[PDB]
RNA sequence: GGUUAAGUGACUAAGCGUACACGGUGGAUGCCUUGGCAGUCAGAGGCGAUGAAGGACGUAUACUUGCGAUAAGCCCAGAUUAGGCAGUAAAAGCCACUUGAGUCUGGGAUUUCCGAAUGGGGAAACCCACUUACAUAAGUAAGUAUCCUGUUGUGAAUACAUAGCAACAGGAGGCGAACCGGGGGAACUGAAACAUCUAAGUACCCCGAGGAAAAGAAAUCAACCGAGAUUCCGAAAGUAGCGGCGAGCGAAAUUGGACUAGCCCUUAAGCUUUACACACGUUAGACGAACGGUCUGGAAAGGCCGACGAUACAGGGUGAUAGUCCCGUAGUUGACGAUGUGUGUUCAGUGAAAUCGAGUAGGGCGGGACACGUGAUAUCCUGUCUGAAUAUGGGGGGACCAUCCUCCAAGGCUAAAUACUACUGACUGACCGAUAGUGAACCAGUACCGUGAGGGAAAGGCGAAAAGAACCCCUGUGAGGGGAGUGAAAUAGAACCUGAAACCGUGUACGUACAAGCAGUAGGAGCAGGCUGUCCUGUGACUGCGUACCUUUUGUAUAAUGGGUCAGCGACUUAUAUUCAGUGGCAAGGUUAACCAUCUAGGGGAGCCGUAGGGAAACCGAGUCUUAACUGGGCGUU
RNA sequence: AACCGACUAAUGUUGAAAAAUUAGCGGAUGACUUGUGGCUAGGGGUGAAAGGCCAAUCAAACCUGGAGAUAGCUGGUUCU
RNA sequence: ACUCCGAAUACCAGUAAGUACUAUCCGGGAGACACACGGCGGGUGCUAACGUCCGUCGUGGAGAGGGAAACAACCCAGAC
RNA sequence: UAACGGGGCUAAGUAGUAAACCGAAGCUGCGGCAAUACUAGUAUUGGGUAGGGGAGCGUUCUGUAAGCGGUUGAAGGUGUGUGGUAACGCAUGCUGGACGUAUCAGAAGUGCGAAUGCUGACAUGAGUAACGAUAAAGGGGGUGAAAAACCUCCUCGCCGGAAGACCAAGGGUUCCUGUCCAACGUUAAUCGGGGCAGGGUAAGUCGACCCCUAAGGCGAGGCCGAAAGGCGUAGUCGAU
RNA sequence: GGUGUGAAGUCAUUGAUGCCAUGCUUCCAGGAAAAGCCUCUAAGCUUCAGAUUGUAAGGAAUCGUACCCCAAACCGACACAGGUGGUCGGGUAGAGAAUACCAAGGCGCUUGAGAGAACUCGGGUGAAGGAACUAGGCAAAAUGGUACCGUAACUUCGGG
RNA sequence: AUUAAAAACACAGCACUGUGCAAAAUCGUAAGAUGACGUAUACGGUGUGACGCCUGCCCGGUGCCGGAAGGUUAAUUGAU
RNA sequence: AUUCCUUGUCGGGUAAGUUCCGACCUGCACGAAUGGCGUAAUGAUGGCCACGCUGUCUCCACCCGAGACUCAGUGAAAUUGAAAUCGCUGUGAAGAUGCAGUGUACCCGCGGCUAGACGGAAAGACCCCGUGAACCUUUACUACAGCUUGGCACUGAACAUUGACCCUGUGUUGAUGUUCUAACGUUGACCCCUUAUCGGGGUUGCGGACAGUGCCUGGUGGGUAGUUUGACUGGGGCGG
């Protein structure tokens, strides 16, 4: 029996282009430039799914960093500090008490410099 | 200048002509073949 | 495919792909690559093999209760509406009616009925007591399509 | 509160982006098909000088179809029966209504011109004649080809004669898809080059048939037993052989089938004709079962309810999907006449070569065919040159000889089983469904291209029905549109089913005029819509990261290749054989092939594989081979 | 001069034109030029000879067929 | 292209522990037979070349991630 | 600039000592999937081209299926939601207007972005080049919906061995008239070699036909040739 | 529009490439064929048939005939700056069918309108110089008629 | 034909050579043709290229022409 | 039109001359009908010089027209993976809009220019490769046509000479020569078919077993045809 490619053919060509809604021009628009659009997104979401596990904690880091030397005291020689006494909040955290709380951040760095 | 189709009916038509076809074994090959393609002009 | 004696332009100059024929399987209008031809598409089955499937068949036919094993089955005019009273009697609407010979009266009778079939045991076929819902045999075919297979 | 200063900063969008909405373009998809494709079972297997195939030009109150100046017809006989005067295609003028309306079938009649084309000629569809009749005017009709065969006449060079010439009769000529016999006969290619060889006696050209053709009744095989023409099919068997022993080529004996038939040169069987019978079929056709209500809907064939037919539930149609509405179907019937077939019974032929085979068999030389390439090469055919015997004889049995066996060449005819299908009918499809299927679903071998041979398209779909939009309005008494009306539907309005994408617009939200690159991604403010702000949607300032895809490569962002985009189509198949694996059946067995068949059954055992190996082989054989023989050793045994 | 030709240049080169135009240039009673009709045809013709020409094509025309030649080469080869 | 001498390594074999689905054999299916750079030992070259030819090990090829500004082939390290 | 990656640095260089930290898809943690072993749990394993192996998705068609779903809305189209590791599935609004088809099997014209692929459509260049001889127009009037282009008048210019008038060829109605202006006409068009309808071609003397023949063609018999045919006599055609 | 009616209508000169002329002269390369036509007889027919001359009567069919032809109608895909055989050829000037300007007759070439840049094309002029340009005077510029005068080397005695 | 017009081709003249006519030569399997209705002052091939002065040496090679003695040598024949 | 070295050398011409003219002769590598050397005339022929002439040039300027530009109407093209399409230095499949670092840079047209986009166009013609192709060549290979040789056939008779063999001089064969006619040839003549330069038949002459053709056979045979003509290689060839 003969089959005809259409019906199937087009589902596959709209799926691909309703993934690259918002993409400018033909990437958006023309099945051959969309395909490679689509592909290329997705290359870059893996990269950044992990990458995004690196840029978050250089961010913390950096306000860390802020935060201890604003309470007298280096990143490198807090985490050394809070290591030594046993304290195990990361740096997620720590960089969120480093904004909301500044208050207890200076307690941390308070109990870091003792165990320095 | 001089193109490659100079036209005359009796040059026409002592070539490529019925009566020209039908004189020779060969030409008679080509009316039975036209004939049998369905050509509507079997000579010019 | 008709035509496509000329090779359509020179191989080199114009610009254009390559072709040789107008009826290359990539153009439109030209040969399917791998055109069908007629097939047979029938299948050796071994003599053992038949005999053993149909064998399987009517084991589990009975096994199911689809075989329904009547004294006679007979049919007096070659009338569908008398088939269709018998049928009801053995309480089946859709059988398979295997009798040693098909009388005349029986096979007209049979015939405007739809999944109702009457064959002889030579004309049983594996997929037929398959695909009829209840196989009637009488007595005799029974004995019969025993001899049949093996 | 004001002024000044400093800082800060919305509100611009010429344009552009993204998203959404609504469109346009376009014609995909889906559904559909009045056309194709492949078959099966039948038919018929030819048509043509009694003028074909195919055309030209005409023909009714442009083209297609029909017909031929008797021109969509005339006649006749059957059959049929309410409408008919072909279509496009309306009008118009008409005819008919139970049988001269008309239709269907058959058979007659008519049948321009061209075309084998045939009176001669010729640029096919035109031009011009002769003869004889007629006409009297300057016309009409008929006849008038060539060749072959035969028969009559005439009748040269020389008598005879023959040639020649004329008349008459009977044939033939052309066309056609395949099948068939014969005459000629490539190359690419393969051989990983190429010359023998292959491709291949293929393609092609030519001639000649016929419904088939051809072949055919042993100077055949076999093997000391036997068989009994030919053809076709299954095996033997990819075996024996052949082969730059390469590439490749490839039998028979024998055996299973299908079908069967032999008959004559002391004149046959058969074939053809002819009539007479009879059968026997075909050819127009006829009748042909059974359904209501209700619901949904534009419409009912659908649903619900209850019926009914079925030797009929093939199939098609009808406003959706119908056993019961229609046409059909099953079944039952029908042929005046005309055809075909088969039997007899006849006729007149043919077979036919007469009389059992001599320029023959055989030979030499050169070629060719046989599976066989000249090889140790039998056999066959024969261009050339030769040349027997003649049943006390001769041919063959694969160099050759002997013996033995078998057959009787140099004369013929012969059905069936076999091949094919352009054409007619019926039926079938895990065949196509408009880029497919035919090149061609449609006015297609057309348009178009070409001097020509030749090449060769595109192009289907309103609706159930045209109900195809009266009338009004804008406009050029336009195009186009808006109303109105039609319709179930008018984004079904003829640029007409569905109506994708590329592509182009209008509108709305958000962004965007200090900002540098594969245009995204991870993050993320603000704004706008929802829903109710650790929501959803759209947009996306700003930050990090980030040089398309394919191909080909050691290696490509590569400035290497390919792609303007979209849609559609476009590439590991099929047959046969070998081998391995999985799965199933059966198991030291397994399995049948053609063919038959009441036909997926069952028959059918020919054959194949397994069951033993060793050896070049004879042959031996659980062994064998090697060798004088193995202490052995090779392979095998299990 | 006509006519036949085609030496130079410029233009043109998606042309007005698949070979021309413009300005000049050669022959111009001859081995001239031209019309009509003939004949020669593909390993063939024809050639005052350029492998020139044989229908805008020529170190072997064009068409159809062998034919899907062959292509150790290049490209391309479709879902997870 | 000499050797009175002469290692490290490597290889061959044996014994032995522990770790490891290893080694081997017989079949079905391939692909590949253009390699590149880097280290080490060399020939060639100029102890030139992103040169060329071998040996051997690594990486690339067929390997992403981090480093080396950017950087197949270097350093670190193997992405369900 | 251009021989720190830049800024910039006299330490932010070089060497060293001490103790820190940053840093990968490495290791760990947490959740999940898979392969292979073992005994559902363990243990190991899961980069990958050529390539091998395994398991599936979807498409058309056949059976299942006169079944099942469908005008109370099929296929297709277009949105949305949802499920799975994926191919994809499911549901559903709108559109659409009649088909579709579970399940399990069966068979393939079974999946396209590439082939300077093929067909159609539609972009970009771009409202760009160009609108075909530089012989040349100006104006009044007319008709018309509209006049640079048609008609008309007055002027101007151009050809005049032609850009005039005839004929043959070749073409084939293009001729004339009315009407129309969609397409055609490189613009518009009232005009046209465009569309549509009607009309128009008158012969003893012109030409053809015809008589005659040239080159040459064909060619009864003939001669020659495997066949097809070739040549050629008598003839018969053949104008220029 | 229609009909109607209409003057003069001569002479001279010039003069074809048209005609006499298919002539004449001359040359060599030596100049169709066949029929119609005239004539002669043959076989054959001889009150004939025929022939000639005349006079009446009748015929002469058929087919083409439009239109385009230095082309928008043919050949060039085009309403294409090309190609396409023959005939006719007025005036002034002129040797002329050259050329210029005109006649008869026919056209303004089927996009227009503005503007007055670069640059391109086709032209005009140019101070001073004058081939310095360039591969090369390529291209331009220049010369250009008639009559008379005059004219070298060289030469095959023609030339030049 | 459409990038070469020339020094290239042709040419008159020259020379060699073939050719006795059913000519040579060429087209063709053949018939038949051309040559030629010609006949060596003709015809064909080859080269040279108006005209003037001239055109040397070499016959080993390879052609061609002639010579035949001998040697070698096919079909054929068929002695042994 | 030949000369490498080479722009030879000398002379002329010019301020200056690889060209030109004259001449020399160590002619790489002229040379006598592939003619040698001259040669009037001729040439859209090659080289060189001079006068005249000039926008050729120094070195352009101005002007007249047709485009270009603007308006209105019509409306192409090659090209195009997608583009949010900067410079520099560096990097990098080794010459960067796209990478790194850095510098610069508001958004968008229009007229111009062509440096880059290894711009467009044409699957490089160069070069190599393919056990590709074609056509051409020859003392490449193998064939074939044609030509030619002999044998046999169509094809015969007499003699004469002679060879072999045979017997007892004799025959049987073979050559060779002459003669002959009867096959065969005749593209001589005449007759007839027959109105015929074909053909056939008849007659006759001239030839005559020759020629010619078939089969076989040796030779010749680029006239023609099919083909072959290695690989490695610091491209390939040459060499090896």
């Not at chain 1, 020689?77 to 969120?96: V, Y």
């Not at chain 2, 074994?25 to 002009?41: M, P, T």
């Not at chain 3, 088939?83 to 009778?109: G, H, M, Q």
Request: no cysteine; aromatic share 8%; glycine share 6%.
């Amino acid at each position: 029996p003969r089959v005809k490619r259409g019906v199937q053919a087009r589902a596959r060509h709209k799926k691909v282009l309703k993934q690259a809604k918002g993409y400018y021009g033909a990437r958006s628009r023309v099945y051959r430039v969309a395909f490679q659009a689509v592909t290329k997104a997705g290359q870059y979401a893996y990269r950044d799914r992990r990458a995004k596990k690196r840029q978050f904690r250089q961010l913390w880091i950096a306000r860390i960093n802020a935060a201890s030397r604003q309470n007298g005291l280096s990143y490198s020689r807090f985490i050394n500090g809070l290591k030594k006494a046993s304290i195990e909040i990361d740096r997620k955290i720590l960089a969120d008490i480093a904004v909301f709380d500044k208050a207890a951040f200076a307690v941390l760095v308070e109990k870091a410099k003792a165990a320095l | 200048m001089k193109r490659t189709f100079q036209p005359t009916v009796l040059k026409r038509k002592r070539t490529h002509g019925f009566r020209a076809r039908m004189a020779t074994k060969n030409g008679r090959k080509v009316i039975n073949a036209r004939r049998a393609k369905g050509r509507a002009r079997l000579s010019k | 495919v008709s035509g496509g004696g000329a090779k359509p332009w020179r191989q080199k100059g114009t610009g254009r792909a390559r072709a040789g024929t107008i009826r290359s399987p990539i153009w439109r209008s030209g040969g399917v690559t791998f055109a069908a031809k007629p097939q047979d598409h029938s299948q050796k089955v071994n003599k053992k093999m038949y005999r053993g499937a149909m064998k399987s068949i009517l084991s589990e036919l009975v096994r199911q209760e689809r075989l329904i094993v009547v004294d006679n089955f007979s049919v007096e005019a070659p009338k569908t509406k008398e088939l269709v009273a018998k049928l009801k009697e053995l309480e089946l609407t859709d059988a398979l009616i295997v009798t040693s010979e098909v009388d005349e009266n029986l096979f007209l009778a049979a015939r405007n009925l739809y999944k109702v079939d009457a064959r002889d045991v030579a004309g049983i076929d594996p997929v037929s007591l398959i695909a009829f819902d209840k196989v009637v045999m009488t007595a005799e075919a029974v004995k019969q399509v025993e001899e049949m297979l093996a």
